Amino acid sequence: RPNHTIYINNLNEKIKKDELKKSLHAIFSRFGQILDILVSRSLKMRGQAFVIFKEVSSATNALRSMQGFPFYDKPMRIQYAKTDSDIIAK
RNA sequence: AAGCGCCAGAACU
RNA sequence: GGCACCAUUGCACUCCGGUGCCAGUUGACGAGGUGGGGUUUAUCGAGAUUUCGGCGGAUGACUCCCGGUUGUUCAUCACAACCGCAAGCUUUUACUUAAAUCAUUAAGGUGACUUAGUGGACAAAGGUGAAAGUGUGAUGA
Ligand SMILES: [Mg+2]
Ligand SMILES: [Mg+2]
Ligand SMILES: [Mg+2]
Incomplete structure (x- = not known):
């Protein structure tokens, strides 16, 4: 069910990797400390983010x-990650 | 201190 | 990379779906070279992914020209090679710091890459000394 990530x-797919990465860090910083934000632009991973929190x-x-x-x-669509991320798991 | 200088093709961001 | 257009609403943790376009970055590593006029695809090695491809520069080669060596001192003249601040040809000999690639580790980059440093090597042509070997003729002292 719930997950760190x-x-x-x-x-918005038009926005570049790092700009998107740093603009998500601008909002999600209030909820807790962020470990990493993983953004790609590939066909299967575009318009998608993975914010890794230290606390669930x-x-x-x-x-x-x-x-x-x-x-x-x-508008954003948020779920929990299906599995834990590498930095969390290890 | 002239194999030296620019950059339509090409290739790689 | 970035503007669009088409496609995609997708559960990842080594990048990466197209085409059109406007910007990037790479695009020669060092030795050696200039009397004027033409003609032309301009010498030498090192590396190996593109130092490919197209474009200009140029000190190259061949040649005409003027100028001058060498062929036994010197003008005039044929010649024969040469040279443009050097100069017949042959052969050895001594100089003429190769740098890049490689390895490496920084710094600056969103990045392709960039600049710089360290260690370690390795050229070829040409030029310049030196030592032999060794190359003309008329006409004047
Ligand atoms: Mg160079
Ligand atoms: Mg040079
Ligand atoms: Mg090869």
């Missing part, structure tokens, strides 16, 4: 609050 989609407590509040939030003209 959160899965975000429906992101933070990832829940981030999921609760930032659901449906218009980010770059497009």
Whole structure:
């Protein structure tokens, strides 16, 4: 069910990797400390983010609050990650 | 201190 | 990389779906070379991914020209090779710091890459000394 890492989609695909990476860090910093934000632009991974929190407590509040939030003209879609990330697992 | 200087093809961001 | 257009709403942790376009970055490593006029695809090695491809520069080669060596001192003249601040040809000999690639580890980059440093080597042609070997003729002292 719940996870340290959160899965975000429906992101604006037109925005470049690092700009998107640093703009997500601008909002999700309040919920807790972020370990890393993983963004790709490939066919299968575009418009998708993976914010890695240190506390699940933070990832829940981030999921609760930032659901449906218009980010770059497009509302966000947040779930928990299906499995734990490498930095969390190891 | 002239194999030296620029950069339509090409290739790699 | 970045603007668009088409496609994609997708659960990852070594990048990477197209085409059109406007910007990037790479695009020669060092030795050696200039009397004027033409003609032309301009010498020498090192590396190996492109130092490929197209474009200009140029001190190259061949040649005409003027100028001058060498062929036994010197003008005039044929010649024969040469040279443009050097100069017949042959052969050895001594100089003429090769750098890059490689390895490496920084620094600056979103990045392709960039600049710089360290260690370790290895050229070829040409030029310049030196030592033999060794190359003309008329007409004047
Ligand atoms: Mg060079
Ligand atoms: Mg040079
Ligand atoms: Mg090869």
